[PDB]
Design a protein around this ligand. Structure first.
Ligand code: U0A
Ligand code: U0A
Ligand code: U0A
Ligand code: U0A
Ligand code: U0A
Ligand code: U0A
Lengths: 142, 142, 142, 142, 142, 142
């Protein structure tokens, strides 16, 4: 079928195309921001909101890809293929767990509605020419 | 942090260790069972229960691994490593999306509570020795 | 437009994908079951339910394809192509009048709701691995 | 059995023999008229009247013949036969989907009873002499 | 995206395909019909109905194309191309502002519902063959 | 007559003269901001507010000019006239669909009243000398 990760949270995968792929912080930073702030809610035995349930899967699905990384680092033959496959998991494949982990850790941190009023307020920033606009891009308010 | 995929649905990842890894139907069967039966509740723009939200991510996360499969099938150098990595995904990492897709497509089809009364009623089956247990293993009732 | 044959009877064409293409009985058998149990309701000058109206067209549309068969059997030049076209009408083209004639002659024979209940009951059967599913697939009850 | 397409709508296939085969507008025009006036009733998931259910099948059955056309245009050997078969589906075979689409499109747009009072009113204007009837054949009123 | 000019006024761009392209009066006539009759509701500083708001844009958008015409008539090099581009605007692109200006100036003069009961009552006119339909085509009543 | 595109939305075409012609983002960006955010409201069969009705025409009118572009790119004789006419459609002619598409996609995105409190709050910025004013121009708040 045609599943969007975001279709029922209030944004489409095309709406997150506003955010350039450089914008999302590194995966090692979001896992810490969620492993050093949400260790009682994520590890808790009862789901809080639809974000916590979607954010377990984002971590665990990334939890298996790293297993794929450590696995491939010790089983292939061609080291170029090893670094080629290991480097491909942290380029485009790792990116889609930067959007996902961002959109949730920024959702249940700044409100499900402040993000969606951020993407619209950030897409309007980048699309503007680099002459008739402010120096800093718009920001998240609690 | 320590995230279990199932901790808030009523079962732990140790509880699903009862089910032997041969038990779970193939991923191509689970995907077709949710695309030919739940093509209205998944694509829909509003989440129904915590299973539908957890089951989008299970499909899409598997949706990216197949992209990793088709990608790796056309970019590596060592074909032996290519197959190794390709088989790997469908070997083990293709397993943890057999438990996940099973536990949900069997949750919101037979009830969130009938599964958990199945694993306990199936773990008690295998536990017994070959020449001690019953013929057919216990089953799911609607 | 995007017309499904089944969209308003309670099932989608993806839902009938559960049934393997070997399952549907032969067209010469369904035309006999309909013509030996649905003559007084089909030939009749007043439609009974939405199945009888959909099942006329299924027979007549198949009534023209056989005319195409008998026509092509006496007008082409290349016998190889003659058979090719003749075998193509009884392979994939004839199949879609096996699903259609099945879903109706099993609808107004066992109830419009027992099929839908059987479709899911049968779909869950095949997807199960061959070890833990019962010997016989689930069945229709009047 | 002996199925008439029209037997339960209020007219027999002999009653439509009044209409000369030149009268029916082209198939590319009725498919547009039905796809430009009935796109929320046909595609809709619930049947409105016995015409909408009979008119899906008329479109889809014609939907497969065009597939036969595009298929035969790329698989036969003798081009003379390819065109012959292609022209055979747009001469006599295509005609019977001009009566059907014409009788179903004028039944839910002018009244299921105004058509049947048209065939009888139009069938008597053709039986009389050319220099006796009105310069125009009788017409449909909403 | 897929925008129809008419999708929310009660008709689709396929529904206006009934009207042959010869039917629409000339643009110089439609512009004079709205400038000598609707010179109070258009220039006015408050929109009356959704037609007046859609009909400003139709005039102004045509207001810029004429500027393109007068511009191109004094800036190109190849006179053949100059005329080609000039004629082009009044050939086809001058047509799609004949449908638009017609459908509105005939909407808010004869009612939004009498037009839509005209296109259906005019498409049924042309559909019929030359020696089968009536003398004068159906007409608009206030 | 004398039609302003904006006269009934709360601003005059002279009021938008504050915005320098460099300010408006490119047409390929606004069509995306409206084709990747308003695909269910614009394509919907019922108009929401006077902006949605004015914004269909802005897209479609631009939809025909691009047809003029692709047309002129394959029919003229003098390639200088081709590039001269094609380049003139994306200079001054394309500009007036940058103001229009801006004023609407910024109207029904930030409120019909926040724009009009922006132009007045932006015209006061540029008119100020480049010495007794802030570094960044004033901005839109949701
Ligand atoms: N903090 S912020 O909200 O991200 C923000 C940061 C910086 C600025 C500087 C000046 N603004 C603009 O030039 C501007 C305004 C409005 C618009 C615009 C550009 N074009 C669009 O195509 C667009 C795209 C998406 C949604 C709406 C729009 S319409 C404003 C806002
Ligand atoms: N249909 S059934 O319920 O699955 C079922 C199938 C087959 C048999 C045959 C003989 N039984 C046993 O040997 C047996 C009984 C009881 C137990 C057992 C083994 N050990 C466990 O570690 C265990 C694991 C989970 C839960 C409870 C237990 S305690 C009984 C029940
Ligand atoms: N009473 S009934 O409706 O006729 C009837 C219902 C159920 C059964 C078989 C039960 N056994 C299982 O091992 C089992 C359980 C659960 C599942 C499963 C197998 N795999 C799937 O891929 C699948 C496919 C579609 C929907 C859910 C699932 S998950 C037989 C009959
Ligand atoms: N506006 S209108 O009602 O459609 C209309 C009706 C009649 C006319 C012209 C004058 N009629 C006749 O010569 C006439 C009369 C009677 C008959 C006839 C022809 N032959 C038949 O074979 C026939 C066919 C069906 C049913 C009865 C009959 S018997 C013009 C218009
Ligand atoms: N004043 S009028 O209503 O416009 C009118 C003018 C002239 C005539 C003369 C003879 N009629 C027909 O041949 C005829 C009748 C019915 C139809 C038809 C053709 N085909 C269509 O595809 C079509 C298209 C749109 C809507 C319905 C239809 S079904 C009748 C009515
Ligand atoms: N975010 S903002 O509102 O665009 C904005 C951006 C930057 C600044 C910096 C300092 N201001 C001024 O020098 C100033 C103030 C007020 C005025 C002014 C200049 N002259 C005008 O002729 C004018 C034009 C239109 C409307 C009112 C006025 S009176 C203020 C506001």
């Amino acid at each position: 079928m045609d599943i969007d990760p975001y279709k029922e949270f209030g944004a489409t995968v095309e709406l997150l195309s506003f955010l350039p792929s450089d914008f999302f912080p590194s995966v090692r930073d979001l896992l810490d921001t969620a492993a050093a702030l949400y260790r009682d809610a994520l590890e808790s035995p009862e789901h809080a909101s639809p974000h916590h349930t979607a954010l377990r899967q984002a971590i665990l699905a990334w939890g298996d890809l790293m297993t794929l990384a450590t696995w491939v680092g010790t089983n292939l033959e061609d080291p170029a293929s090893r670094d080629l496959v290991v480097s491909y998991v942290n380029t485009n494949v790792g990116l889609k767990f930067r959007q996902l982990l961002w959109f949730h850790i920024s959702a249940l941190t700044f409100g499900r509605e402040t993000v969606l009023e951020y993407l619209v307020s950030f897409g309007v920033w980048i699309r503007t020419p680099p002459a008739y606009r402010p120096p800093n891009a718009p920001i998240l308010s609690t």
